[PDB]
Structure 1
Amino acid sequence: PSEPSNFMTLMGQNGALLTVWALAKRNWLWAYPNIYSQDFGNIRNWKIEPGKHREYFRFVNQSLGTCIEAYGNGLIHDTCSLDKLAQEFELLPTDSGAVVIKSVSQGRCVTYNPVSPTYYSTVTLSTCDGATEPLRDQTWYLAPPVLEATAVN
């Protein structure tokens, strides 16, 4: 199809995908690998669009149509609004090809714990230092969405 190409997943170094857990708006976002969230469906896929401002972006949920928003020390998803700065992020390149997601409104980066005694990572916002530790990592991969793929060869 032609719509799938519009979605992707933000995968942490642990394979954990930034996702909506609680479908209701304004609830925190978490990170679950596909292997442990198969029943989550497309709430794990996002569409990256240009923000209100030039080099900024916003993330629109494939299934819910909601946007990621910097809120407090973490991320939530709420109704999309181009005038909400908290919904605009910078995708900073790194020397490995991975990206660091920075909140324009906060100036802090999307942090997570690659290592967990549970099947999910907690997502927070903190000083952008490009840390890559077992319990604190700030690098993500812009990867394919978790959807069935059609060969176009």
Structure 2
Amino acid sequence: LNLLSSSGPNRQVLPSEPSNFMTLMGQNGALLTVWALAKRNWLWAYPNIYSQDFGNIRNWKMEPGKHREYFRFVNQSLGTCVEAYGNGLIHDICSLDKLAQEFELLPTDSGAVVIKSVSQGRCVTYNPVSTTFYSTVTLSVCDGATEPSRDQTWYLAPPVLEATAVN
């Protein structure tokens, strides 16, 4: 395309929208994601390599919650929110008044974070090692364990999207 049109500079495409999203990545590379699309279904964690067909349901927009120091996660594709429910996480209609959709992220000394459900007082747990495509995501006591069958550390990572260089 032309960087200069006959009457003035012409705006090239360089999306800012992708900057608003990210992924929550486990130590095994698995990304917290919606699987069954209908609301209230359980969330799981699949690495990009085993979920290319999932698309943007794997990306989330992290925003401050209603309460100070808490965050909520809005799905890029579905617009629903991560919500603590029973012994795991689901996605449902967003509401700043639902404490179950608010999370406190506790930094670790490696720079990773532990995700704590504020309504439950429990942390998002998963099994790094799996005989299948995914890690099972649950909520359990926050001990910061980092074992093959039980880990609670997550990385705040780039979204799985085409990236545009800004150098």
Q: TM-score range by the shorter chain?
A: over 0.9
Question: How many angstroms does 1:22 deviate by?
Answer: 0.4
Question: How many angstroms does 1:95 deviate by?
Answer: 0.4
Question: How many angstroms does 1:63 deviate by?
Answer: 0.3
Question: How many angstroms does 1:2 deviate by?
Answer: 0.7
- CA offset digits 1:8-36 (Å, max 9, x no partner): 00000000000000000000000000000
- CA offset digits 1:65-84 (Å, max 9, x no partner): 00000000000000000110
Name the residue aligned to 1:57: 71
Question: How many angstroms does 1:136 deviate by?
Answer: 0.2
Aligned mates of 2:148, 2:70 — CA distance in 1: 29
- CA offset digits 1:111-143 (Å, max 9, x no partner): 000000001000000000000000000000000
Question: How many angstroms does 1:48 deviate by?
Answer: 0.3
TM-score under structure 2 normalisation? Answer: 0.91
Task: Provide the secondary structure at the position in 1 that maps to 2:79.
Answer: coil
Aligned mates of 2:149, 2:76 — CA distance in 1: 29
Runs of 4+ in 1 over 2 A off after TM superposition: none
1:98 aligns with 2:112: yes
How many residues are aligned here?
A: 153
- CA offset digits 1:75-120 (Å, max 9, x no partner): 0000000110000000110000000000000000000000000010
TM-score under structure 1 normalisation? Answer: 1.00
Task: Provide the secondary structure at the position in 1 that maps to 2:150.
Answer: coil
Aligned mates of 1:76, 1:9 — CA distance in 2: 16
Gaps of 5+ in 1: none
Question: How many angstroms does 1:5 deviate by?
Answer: 0.3
Aligned mates of 2:164, 2:54 — CA distance in 1: 21
Task: Provide the secondary structure at the position in 2 that maps to 1:129.
Answer: coil
Aligned mates of 2:49, 2:33 — CA distance in 1: 13
Question: How many angstroms does 1:46 deviate by?
Answer: 0.2
- CA offset digits 1:43-64 (Å, max 9, x no partner): 0000000101010000000000
Query: Greater CA radius of gyration, 1 or 2?
Result: 2
Aligned mates of 2:137, 2:153 — CA distance in 1: 12
Q: How high is the sequence identity, in percent, across the aligned residues?
A: 95
Task: Provide the secondary structure at the position in 1 that maps to 2:154.
Answer: strand
Aligned mates of 2:42, 2:29 — CA distance in 1: 19
Gaps of 5+ in 2: 1-14
1:83 is aligned, of 70, 75, 97, to 97
